[PDB]
Amino acid sequence: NVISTLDLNLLTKGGGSWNVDGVNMKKSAVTTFDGKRVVKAVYDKNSGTSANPGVGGFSFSAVPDGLNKNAITFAWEVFYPKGFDFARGGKHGGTFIGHGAASGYQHSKTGASNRIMWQEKGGVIDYIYPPSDLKQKIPGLDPEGHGIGFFQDDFKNALKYDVWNRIEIGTKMNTFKNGIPQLDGESYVIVNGKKEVLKRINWSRSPDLLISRFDWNTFFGGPLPSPKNQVAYFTNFQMKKYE
Protein backbone atom coordinates (compact mmCIF):
# COMPACT_ATOMS: atom_id res chain seq x y z
CA ASN A 1 0.00 0.00 0.00
CA VAL A 2 3.00 2.34 -0.09
CA ILE A 3 3.01 4.52 -3.18
CA SER A 4 6.30 6.21 -2.45
CA THR A 5 8.70 7.05 0.37
CA LEU A 6 10.35 10.44 0.75
CA ASP A 7 14.11 10.31 0.35
CA LEU A 8 15.33 12.72 3.05
CA ASN A 9 18.64 13.06 1.25
CA LEU A 10 16.65 15.04 -1.31
CA LEU A 11 14.62 17.09 1.21
CA THR A 12 16.08 20.46 0.18
CA LYS A 13 16.80 19.40 -3.45
CA GLY A 14 13.15 18.94 -4.54
CA GLY A 15 12.28 15.73 -2.73
CA GLY A 16 12.42 13.56 -5.88
CA SER A 17 8.91 12.59 -6.89
CA TRP A 18 7.50 14.18 -3.72
CA ASN A 19 8.02 17.71 -5.18
CA VAL A 20 9.00 19.08 -1.77
CA ASP A 21 8.91 22.84 -1.48
CA GLY A 22 8.85 25.44 1.29
CA VAL A 23 11.39 23.65 3.54
CA ASN A 24 11.98 25.55 6.75
CA MET A 25 14.84 23.59 8.33
CA LYS A 26 15.30 26.10 11.18
CA LYS A 27 17.64 24.39 13.71
CA SER A 28 16.70 20.91 12.54
CA ALA A 29 18.83 18.68 10.36
CA VAL A 30 18.76 15.60 8.20
CA THR A 31 21.09 13.11 9.90
CA THR A 32 21.50 9.53 10.88
CA PHE A 33 20.10 8.19 14.13
CA ASP A 34 19.61 4.54 15.16
CA GLY A 35 20.74 3.36 11.73
CA LYS A 36 18.09 5.39 9.92
CA ARG A 37 18.08 8.54 7.81
CA VAL A 38 16.02 10.98 9.88
CA VAL A 39 15.22 14.59 10.51
CA LYS A 40 16.41 15.61 13.97
CA ALA A 41 13.67 18.09 14.94
CA VAL A 42 15.12 20.66 17.30
CA TYR A 43 12.65 22.41 19.56
CA ASP A 44 14.25 25.17 21.59
CA LYS A 45 12.80 26.29 24.89
CA ASN A 46 9.90 28.70 24.33
CA SER A 47 9.44 27.63 20.69
CA GLY A 48 5.94 26.92 19.40
CA THR A 49 3.70 28.96 17.19
CA SER A 50 4.70 32.42 15.91
CA ALA A 51 3.42 33.85 19.15
CA ASN A 52 6.36 32.22 20.93
CA PRO A 53 9.86 33.61 20.46
CA GLY A 54 11.96 30.46 20.28
CA VAL A 55 13.02 28.51 17.21
CA GLY A 56 11.59 25.06 16.93
CA GLY A 57 10.71 22.20 14.63
CA PHE A 58 10.79 22.18 10.85
CA SER A 59 8.34 22.31 7.98
CA PHE A 60 7.89 21.49 4.32
CA SER A 61 5.11 20.89 1.81
CA ALA A 62 4.88 18.23 -0.85
CA VAL A 63 2.56 17.34 -3.74
CA PRO A 64 3.88 13.88 -4.59
CA ASP A 65 3.56 12.30 -7.97
CA GLY A 66 0.91 9.62 -7.43
CA LEU A 67 -1.20 11.74 -5.03
CA ASN A 68 -4.79 10.50 -5.28
CA LYS A 69 -6.71 13.75 -4.81
CA ASN A 70 -9.79 11.89 -3.65
CA ALA A 71 -8.23 9.70 -0.91
CA ILE A 72 -4.72 9.39 0.41
CA THR A 73 -2.75 8.48 3.52
CA PHE A 74 0.50 9.92 4.78
CA ALA A 75 2.62 8.13 7.34
CA TRP A 76 5.84 8.71 9.28
CA GLU A 77 7.66 7.43 12.33
CA VAL A 78 8.80 9.46 15.35
CA PHE A 79 11.25 8.75 18.16
CA TYR A 80 10.93 10.70 21.43
CA PRO A 81 13.97 10.11 23.63
CA LYS A 82 13.20 9.41 27.28
CA GLY A 83 12.55 12.69 29.15
CA PHE A 84 10.98 14.51 26.21
CA ASP A 85 8.37 16.87 27.60
CA PHE A 86 5.22 16.88 25.46
CA ALA A 87 3.90 19.94 27.29
CA ARG A 88 0.23 20.24 26.28
CA GLY A 89 0.57 19.07 22.69
CA GLY A 90 1.83 20.16 19.28
CA LYS A 91 1.71 19.39 15.61
CA HIS A 92 3.21 16.85 13.25
CA GLY A 93 1.57 17.46 9.86
CA GLY A 94 -1.18 16.23 7.57
CA THR A 95 -3.15 16.96 4.47
CA PHE A 96 -4.69 20.14 3.08
CA ILE A 97 -7.83 20.25 0.94
CA GLY A 98 -8.57 22.83 -1.77
CA HIS A 99 -6.92 26.23 -1.30
CA GLY A 100 -7.31 29.03 1.23
CA ALA A 101 -6.51 29.24 4.89
CA ALA A 102 -7.24 26.21 7.06
CA SER A 103 -4.90 26.69 9.98
CA GLY A 104 -3.47 29.51 12.06
CA TYR A 105 -6.86 30.46 13.57
CA GLN A 106 -8.14 31.22 10.05
CA HIS A 107 -10.68 29.37 7.91
CA SER A 108 -11.79 29.73 4.30
CA LYS A 109 -14.68 28.62 2.16
CA THR A 110 -12.34 26.71 -0.12
CA GLY A 111 -9.88 25.09 2.25
CA ALA A 112 -9.67 22.44 4.95
CA SER A 113 -6.94 20.52 6.72
CA ASN A 114 -6.48 17.16 8.46
CA ARG A 115 -3.51 17.01 10.80
CA ILE A 116 -1.97 14.91 13.52
CA MET A 117 -1.35 16.57 16.86
CA TRP A 118 0.38 15.11 19.87
CA GLN A 119 -1.16 15.82 23.26
CA GLU A 120 -0.18 15.83 26.90
CA LYS A 121 1.57 12.66 28.03
CA GLY A 122 2.18 11.56 24.46
CA GLY A 123 -1.45 11.33 23.40
CA VAL A 124 -2.53 11.75 19.79
CA ILE A 125 -5.53 13.35 18.12
CA ASP A 126 -6.85 14.00 14.67
CA TYR A 127 -7.01 17.80 14.28
CA ILE A 128 -9.29 19.26 11.62
CA TYR A 129 -9.92 22.76 10.28
CA PRO A 130 -13.13 22.43 8.22
CA PRO A 131 -14.23 24.92 5.57
CA SER A 132 -16.25 27.96 6.39
CA ASP A 133 -19.82 28.07 5.25
CA LEU A 134 -20.03 24.32 4.64
CA LYS A 135 -22.64 22.17 6.30
CA GLN A 136 -21.43 19.49 8.73
CA LYS A 137 -23.39 16.90 10.66
CA ILE A 138 -20.69 15.98 13.15
CA PRO A 139 -21.39 18.00 16.28
CA GLY A 140 -18.79 20.68 16.94
CA LEU A 141 -17.09 20.34 13.51
CA ASP A 142 -17.21 24.13 13.25
CA PRO A 143 -15.09 26.47 11.10
CA GLU A 144 -14.38 28.98 13.81
CA GLY A 145 -11.60 29.43 16.38
CA HIS A 146 -9.03 26.64 16.64
CA GLY A 147 -9.21 23.26 14.96
CA ILE A 148 -11.40 20.41 16.08
CA GLY A 149 -9.80 17.38 17.80
CA PHE A 150 -10.96 13.79 17.57
CA PHE A 151 -9.82 10.51 19.13
CA GLN A 152 -8.42 11.92 22.35
CA ASP A 153 -9.76 8.97 24.36
CA ASP A 154 -8.38 6.41 21.92
CA PHE A 155 -4.70 7.36 21.89
CA LYS A 156 -3.86 8.44 25.43
CA ASN A 157 -0.11 8.03 25.99
CA ALA A 158 0.11 6.35 22.60
CA LEU A 159 3.50 7.91 21.83
CA LYS A 160 5.97 5.89 23.84
CA TYR A 161 9.54 6.89 24.69
CA ASP A 162 12.66 5.41 23.08
CA VAL A 163 10.75 3.68 20.24
CA TRP A 164 9.89 4.37 16.64
CA ASN A 165 6.22 5.24 16.92
CA ARG A 166 4.36 4.63 13.66
CA ILE A 167 1.83 7.27 12.70
CA GLU A 168 -0.57 7.44 9.75
CA ILE A 169 -3.26 9.87 8.78
CA GLY A 170 -5.84 9.07 6.10
CA THR A 171 -8.07 11.54 4.32
CA LYS A 172 -10.96 10.62 2.00
CA MET A 173 -12.93 13.29 0.22
CA ASN A 174 -16.65 13.39 0.39
CA THR A 175 -18.51 12.68 -2.84
CA PHE A 176 -20.81 15.13 -4.60
CA LYS A 177 -24.17 14.29 -6.07
CA ASN A 178 -25.51 16.80 -8.53
CA GLY A 179 -22.95 19.14 -6.95
CA ILE A 180 -24.08 18.85 -3.32
CA PRO A 181 -21.43 17.59 -0.89
CA GLN A 182 -22.62 14.24 0.46
CA LEU A 183 -21.31 14.20 4.11
CA ASP A 184 -19.48 10.95 3.43
CA GLY A 185 -15.86 12.13 3.69
CA GLU A 186 -13.65 10.33 6.15
CA SER A 187 -10.51 10.63 8.22
CA TYR A 188 -8.48 8.02 10.05
CA VAL A 189 -5.51 8.00 12.39
CA ILE A 190 -3.25 5.08 13.09
CA VAL A 191 -0.79 5.05 15.97
CA ASN A 192 1.36 1.89 16.44
CA GLY A 193 -1.15 -0.25 14.63
CA LYS A 194 -4.31 1.07 16.39
CA LYS A 195 -6.68 2.71 13.88
CA GLU A 196 -9.60 5.04 14.51
CA VAL A 197 -11.94 6.34 11.79
CA LEU A 198 -14.17 9.40 11.63
CA LYS A 199 -16.94 9.24 8.98
CA ARG A 200 -19.51 11.76 7.70
CA ILE A 201 -17.26 14.71 6.97
CA ASN A 202 -17.72 17.41 4.34
CA TRP A 203 -14.15 18.16 3.22
CA SER A 204 -15.00 20.67 0.49
CA ARG A 205 -17.86 22.48 -1.13
CA SER A 206 -17.27 21.54 -4.76
CA PRO A 207 -15.60 18.77 -6.78
CA ASP A 208 -12.80 21.04 -8.01
CA LEU A 209 -11.54 21.32 -4.40
CA LEU A 210 -9.79 18.06 -3.54
CA ILE A 211 -6.73 16.98 -1.59
CA SER A 212 -4.02 19.41 -2.67
CA ARG A 213 -0.89 18.86 -0.59
CA PHE A 214 0.92 17.24 2.26
CA ASP A 215 1.92 19.87 4.76
CA TRP A 216 4.55 19.06 7.37
CA ASN A 217 4.99 21.64 10.13
CA THR A 218 6.02 20.38 13.54
CA PHE A 219 6.00 22.69 16.56
CA PHE A 220 4.65 22.94 20.07
CA GLY A 221 1.20 24.24 20.85
CA GLY A 222 -0.64 26.30 20.86
CA PRO A 223 -0.88 27.68 23.22
CA LEU A 224 2.08 26.31 25.20
CA PRO A 225 5.57 26.24 23.70
CA SER A 226 8.35 23.77 24.35
CA PRO A 227 9.30 23.95 28.04
CA LYS A 228 12.97 23.09 27.41
CA ASN A 229 15.47 22.59 24.61
CA GLN A 230 14.74 19.07 23.30
CA VAL A 231 14.75 16.97 20.14
CA ALA A 232 12.71 14.30 18.43
CA TYR A 233 13.51 12.30 15.32
CA PHE A 234 11.23 11.77 12.33
CA THR A 235 11.76 9.22 9.58
CA ASN A 236 10.19 7.08 6.90
CA PHE A 237 7.72 9.59 5.46
CA GLN A 238 5.38 7.63 3.16
CA MET A 239 2.49 8.32 0.87
CA LYS A 240 0.07 5.37 1.02
CA LYS A 241 -3.20 4.23 -0.46
CA TYR A 242 -6.24 5.14 1.64
CA GLU A 243 -7.07 1.76 3.17
From TrEMBL:
Highest rank taxon of the organism: Viruses
The residues the record assigns to binding beta-D-glucuronate 1 are: 91, 104-105, 115, 127, 129, 222
Give the residues the record marks as binding beta-D-glucuronate 2. 119, 149, 152
Coiled coil spans? none
Polysaccharide lyase domain ranges (all copies): 35-237
This chain belongs to the protein called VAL-1
- What species was this sequence derived from? Chlorella virus
